[PDB]
Design goal:
Elements: E1 7-12, E2 22-31, E3 37-42, E4 45-46, E5 51-52, E6 56-57, E7 62-71, E8 79-84, E9 92-95
Antiparallel strand pairs: 1-2, 2-7, 3-4, 3-8, 5-7, 6-7, 8-9
The protein binds copper (II) ion (CU).
Copper (II) ion is lined by residues 1-3, 31-32.
């Protein structure tokens, strides 16, 4: 019964070491999940082997949700989460910043 753009936070499971394998995470929360579409991107390109958790929600249908994939970072490679949702007129993109 309330409306809001979905919050998106992008972080790595362990602290990042170039060349060392790790996991990339995108935590999405908001209202009215409603077929929301989430992708992870390596240099603007959609990744294939992406897992997600069950979607958690409460009465008013606020929700959170996690998408992730194993990956192994470098300085050259650009990583990001991309979300598609009714409240968005276009796909929203948050970049993974290992210092932020
Ligand atoms: Cu609502």
């Amino acid at each position: 019964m309330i409306q809001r753009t979905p919050k998106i936070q992008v972080y790595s499971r362990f602290p990042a070491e170039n060349g060392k394998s790790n996991f990339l995470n995108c935590y999405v929360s908001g209202f009215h999940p409603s077929d929301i579409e989430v992708d992870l991107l390596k240099n603007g390109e959609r990744i294939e082997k992406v897992e997600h958790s069950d979607l958690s929600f409460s009465k008013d249908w606020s929700f959170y949700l996690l998408y992730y994939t194993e990956f192994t970072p470098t300085e050259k490679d650009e990583y990001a989460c991309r979300v598609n949702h009714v409240t968005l007129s276009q796909p929203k993109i948050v970049k993974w910043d290992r210092d932020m």
